[PDB]
Amino acid sequence: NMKTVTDGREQGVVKWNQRFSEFASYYGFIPKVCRPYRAQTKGKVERAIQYIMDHFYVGTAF
């Protein structure tokens, strides 16, 4: 639930940001939002974040 993709739960239903909704309709992909304060529903990407931040960005210097 990022404000760059939504604008709050209008009584349970989600209100999509108009510009982002236009962007999604342009590329055709349907957006979805998991839920407030529940990151389990997107465990794949969070675990990938753990993977990258404990494998790549641990000692690499730039």
Add this chain to the structure above:
DNA sequence: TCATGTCAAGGCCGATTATTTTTTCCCCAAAATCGCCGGTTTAAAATTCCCCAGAAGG
């Protein structure tokens, strides 16, 4: 058909490979210990030879 947690690393165990140390086996030579047989010595037991008494036979 919605929404819905997933992946990697670390630790432990087992098996395999490599290195080192210890123990055993086989063959030969020398020394020591043990076993068997024979001979010698000691102790105990058996047999035969002379005079006194008793019993039996002619």
